[PDB]
Amino acid sequence: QTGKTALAIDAIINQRDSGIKAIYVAIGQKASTISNVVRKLEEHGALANTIVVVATASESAALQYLAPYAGAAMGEYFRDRGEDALIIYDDLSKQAVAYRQISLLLRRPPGREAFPGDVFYLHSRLLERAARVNAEYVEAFTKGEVKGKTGSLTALPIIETQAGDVSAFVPTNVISITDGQIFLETNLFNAGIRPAVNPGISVSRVGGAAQTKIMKKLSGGIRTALAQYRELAAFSQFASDLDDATRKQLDHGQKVTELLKQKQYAPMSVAQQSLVLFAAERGYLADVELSKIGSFEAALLAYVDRDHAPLMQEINQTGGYNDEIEGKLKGILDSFKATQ
Amino acid sequence: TNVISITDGQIFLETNLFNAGIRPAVNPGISVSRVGGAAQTKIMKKLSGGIRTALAQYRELAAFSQFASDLDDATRKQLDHGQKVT
Amino acid sequence: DPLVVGQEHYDTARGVQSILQRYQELKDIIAILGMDELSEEDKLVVARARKIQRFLSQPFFVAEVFTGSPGKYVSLKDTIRGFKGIMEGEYDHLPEQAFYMVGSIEEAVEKAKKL
Amino acid sequence: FRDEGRDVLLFVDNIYRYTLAGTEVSALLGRMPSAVGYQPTLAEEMGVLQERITSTKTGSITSVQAVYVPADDLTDPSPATTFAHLDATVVLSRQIASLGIYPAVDPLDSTSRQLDPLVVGQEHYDTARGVQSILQRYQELKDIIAILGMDELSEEDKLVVARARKIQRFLSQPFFVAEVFTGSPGKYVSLKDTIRGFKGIMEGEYDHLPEQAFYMVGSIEEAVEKAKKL
Amino acid sequence: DLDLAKASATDQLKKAKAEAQVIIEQANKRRSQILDEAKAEAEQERTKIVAQ
Amino acid sequence: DLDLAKASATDQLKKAKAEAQVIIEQANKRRSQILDEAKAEAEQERTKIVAQ
Amino acid sequence: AGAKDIRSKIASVQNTQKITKAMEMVAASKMRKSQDRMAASRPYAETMRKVIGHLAHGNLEYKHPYLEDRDVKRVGYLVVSTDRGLAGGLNINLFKKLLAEMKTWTDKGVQADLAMIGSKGVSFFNSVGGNVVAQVTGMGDNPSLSELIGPVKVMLQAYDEGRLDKLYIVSNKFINTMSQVPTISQLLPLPASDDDDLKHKSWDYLYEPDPKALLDTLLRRYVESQVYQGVVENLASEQAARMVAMKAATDNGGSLIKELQLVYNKARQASITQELTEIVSGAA
């Protein structure tokens, strides 16, 4: 109950207009939950771009265990054709449980938590099918139909820890197999900071080579500002009349923290994210460091849409950044401050 | 775990209370009777209802106010009364 | 969900949870270093937290045999109205026991008067 | 390659994965587990690997092994078995990298059990102990400085902080493989050259150079060329 | 010194009045956008639901 | 008189901006009403078309 | 043991250590403000006491009750204290040193009258049983002479109505940024023990009209200036003692974290071996 599914299906919903096809695999989910999700997928956007694979908690362990491999075979079809795809595996812990049941009923020798000896080789061989693949491979697979494309299959496995134990066998296996995790802490979620991502423990091993340029330029300081807020949050609890350097830094940290939260089924395009981060990074919030920040963002997004949409088209197309874009973003922010 | 699951209540007796000299070393708030008030005489029923809450909240206040040298006399009153009943 | 409950209900719930979470982290700090080393806005939110954490309690008709008191049924609207009033501080001046084991917030002010 | 008479390096991308794969194979074969679920032959399967990696009357194999400690627990049997074999420990630090010092090796947490006077020689030993002591003292004075101010520092402690900043910078080096990032030529410092450089900085020669003279500069004789231009 | 009392004060009324009207108008703009889009979604969602 | 002219200019804006905002919040309330209305209206269209 | 409860204690001790480090931040910055205030107060009060030292000894002597070395029937103390905790033993050591001197007078049958400038002193001496005749508390981060005058005005009235014969201030000296000591200082009855003004014995001091009113005013200012410096210096001492205490509490919290972690790691390893042993035995 921290938003693991909410984050994944919002990821799927944001692919409505990218060429990235999407797959949601529901392992051991209860059927009425799946049905509620599927209805949300049609209502808030497109279920046309998503394949839904279902193995409910009432179905046999063999069907649960294999399910994710069947979904990977459906996504591995697009990868080998030259087209990008995104697969979400929901509860790889439930797949591990199903395999444990099958292994024990077949009498196979038990391991650390009764899980079988090859439980690593289950998820390892599942997830290492998620790859980006070169044009030579995709041209030799298709036998010369696509020629200059490079297919890919992005994967987002979901894991549930128990009371946040990160040293349990299945979590530590999957954390070694993958390359970055989005760690969703529970006491941030209880605090209402949803989505409750926890920086510093959540990393991305691929780095900023995956970011587009404008998102890369406007995000470097955010990481440092939140790091500085982590340490200066202890001081904020009980103390005041610190140095104004520190005071400024702490305040800005608390308001960038306030900025990085949003409603569930609102996804945000790169241009909208860009300008909101620019507003935080260039200091246009520094005088607005009060509870209105949510209204400020909604008003800024409405204003930007109303007056300067060809810029939003150009950024949503290119993600480019340069001095002319930097100046235009300044002009837009300067004008918006004069309004509400 | 099994016997705690089967029975109609518990009396917990504790080493810390026994060494501190609270003998019988019953810990209230960790011991319950699910029959409760039905198994009492009407006098005992009447007098005992106030005691059950008073000791449980007294241990909370006694933990929360170890270090405050001065206190609100509402809280202070309760604290003393709890030491009296203990 | 704000969509399916009233949006005031949702806002009240988010407030209540945020406050109680903010109390929990303060608990061990007060226990070791003492209440005097809080700040005034934390001393405020620790008080409102205690008032909220009392107003969650309730007498039940089926839990009358155990405690010797009548049972209370609160309507949903009255519950929202009370917790919003407590968080907005309309009852900040009442003691904690004025909220303990009571029905609606009108009964919190009646018992406060008796207190 | 050893039997040809060369000095080889063997890199192991993770030795923990070797141990854990040994657990998986042992569970598939069904043998009763021991300790924290590890295989019954844990120390033997480690010893069979680690004892082949040795110097010999012809050539040698040196090995640099990456080490993952499960659950941060230095007492867990895979760490505890591995550490018996390691002769040295190099720690890489995000903090040192953030300063821009490369290679980002923490000098205080890194160790070697070669670093004893009857093995390494007295001059090297006492130099390395000296640099360790200076950087440790500085690591304490930095806490003070922040807590109060540089005003508190005595003139001696200011000379400690200055020499420590020079030493810390003089640990950085330009690598031949890193030219693209840095654009610098790249250098290979001899053992005597580094010992002389740190001895000089510790005994207070070059106390008249600026600390930016030492950054990425290679040997100390190039530190004075840079300070000549600077 | 007096002469300036009228002249200096001219900007306060002149500029304030203009800005006040401009923001007032800006609201009627927000209202027009919000209700014209409400009308658009009110028709798009009706046609969508009957095709589903 | 000059100082009085300065104060009234700072006032004017505050009244004007708070006067634009109430139009904006009225529009949001009316939008929530008219969107629910559209949803129910098409709903009744769906109910009859699916039963038929 | 117990993995979740130990991991909960580790979390709580970690966060407590992080707070005691921040308190050490507030304590050092307040020490900066407090000691520069002291450095400003020091010249004026030091020269005022020098001035009276010159008046102590030299002719054309008028005769005045604060000037003569009268006999001791009872003794007055002005006691400064903190109102807060976490300052280590600064108040305890001062209160003990006073209690020793007050015992020495009580051996002589000389009673003690006590005026308290802090809540810790009020609590301690009321509950021990010293005659608290005046008290002010909660002066604030910036203390001001104006509030402190009333207790002094009471002690002055007790002297000038003739009841109170010897008067002291007891306070901690800011000997260094990291060293301080409790002191009992003789205050109002101007000690003839001080050096004779033989160095400028050409001068026999002479007066503008009404030496009584002028001199009375000047001694009123002297006593007050002495009390104000003694308070500002005790607040600088307080901030130094708090920073030392918080540093100790930070190191002790780290010492607990490093030992609870060893208990937790040993427990997780045993839990991992009790199971598995029981799954292999059950698999049979």
Ligand SMILES: Nc1ncnc2c1ncn2[C@@H]1O[C@H](COP(=O)(O)OP(=O)(O)OP(=O)(O)O)[C@@H](O)[C@H]1O
């Ligand atoms: N950004 C958000 N704002 C407000 N509420 C949210 C947000 N994201 C998620 N929620 C709510 O959090 C709750 C839990 O979300 P979700 O079901 O995704 O968590 P989960 O980790 O998947 O739980 P489980 O693991 O039990 O499936 C839901 O009620 C969802 O509506």
Ligand SMILES: [Mg+2]
């Ligand atoms: Mg969920």
